[PDB]
């Protein structure tokens, strides 16, 4: 399920053809507003623990916006994931 | 295999925002009653026999 969740938020980089039309809200906002050069969610596993999160690369003036949208997306999945975005993931 | 009080208070009351608020509403109405009754008792005891409510019986019948 975490992998599905991470697929919903996805990854992104300035060379993606999708742009404003990308399904992931984070990727879409990032592209239209030029919030980052790139980002990727990740789920690094170890025996009984791991790191579940994301990494992003951006201009010095976009860090706060990136963080805001990224966390807003985690929060939206916790309380409001939709069947259709989940099927997509 | 057993939690602590705070862990239980966390899970059932504080975690959800809707429930963290109901907890405060309820706690506030309960605290108000207990605090006012308690403080009023302390004040009246410190001043036993001096307040109108303490000597009133002597004049009442009205």
């Amino acid at each position: 399920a975490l992998q599905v969740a991470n697929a919903i938020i996805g990854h992104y980089d300035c060379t993606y053809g999708g742009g404003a039309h990308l399904s992931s809200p984070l990727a879409s906002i990032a592209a239209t507003n030029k919030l980052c050069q790139s980002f990727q969610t990740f789920n690094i596993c170890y025996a009984d623990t791991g790191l579940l999160g994301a990494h992003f690369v951006c201009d010095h003036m976009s860090i706060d916006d990136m963080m805001f949208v990224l966390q807003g997306q985690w929060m939206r999945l916790c309380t409001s994931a939709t069947e259709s975005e989940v099927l997509r993931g | 295999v057993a939690p602590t009080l705070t862990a239980r208070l966390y899970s059932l009351l504080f975690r959800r925002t809707s429930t963290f608020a109901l907890t405060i509403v309820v706690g506030a109405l309960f605290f108000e009653r207990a605090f006012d009754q308690g403080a009023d008792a302390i004040y009246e005891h410190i001043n036993e026999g001096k307040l109108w409510k303490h000597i009133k019986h002597k004049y009442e019948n009205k």
Partner: peptide
């Protein structure tokens, strides 16, 4: 979605508040 359950505890709050507060 979660909005009914949330709108239902938000409902309650307002109610309890008025009841009490007022």
């Amino acid at each position: 979605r979660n909005w009914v359950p949330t709108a239902q505890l938000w409902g309650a709050v307002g109610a309890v508040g008025l009841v009490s507060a007022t």
